Design a protein around this ligand. Sequence first.
Ligand code: HEC
Length: 106
Amino acid sequence: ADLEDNMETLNDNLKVIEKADNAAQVKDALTKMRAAALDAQKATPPKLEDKSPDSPEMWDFRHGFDILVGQIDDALKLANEGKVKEAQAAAEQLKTTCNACHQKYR
Ligand code: HEC
């Protein structure tokens, strides 16, 4: 799907994690964020449409997602350890990554 769709998926699932009823719901949401994040990483955002694929900007753009996926995976580990609250806390920390990217490229 396109960048926008992927972003909506991330935002939607993040709020799901915050509402987190059970471990299952947090894991499902995190898993969907993982896929959406990796999918988004392959797109070319509007602000960089005129830039080369190998440009420093694009690599920086792609880097933002490497960080997000790492954080998501770490939250996944916590969730699969049965530590649901810590995993939700970790999901909250993710926001810093979202905001950083939006500042430069949104
Ligand atoms: C860069 C590496 C990004 C990371 C990490 C995240 N987002 Fe993002 N987001 C990015 C761009 C360039 C844009 C503009 C997309 C466009 O062309 O319209 C966005 C936009 C959003 C939006 C609003 C627009 C929409 O999705 O329709 C939301 C709701 C959004 N992003 C949420 C979001 C969340 C929750 C993230 C972290 C968990 C996140 N984004 C990361 C680039 C990047």
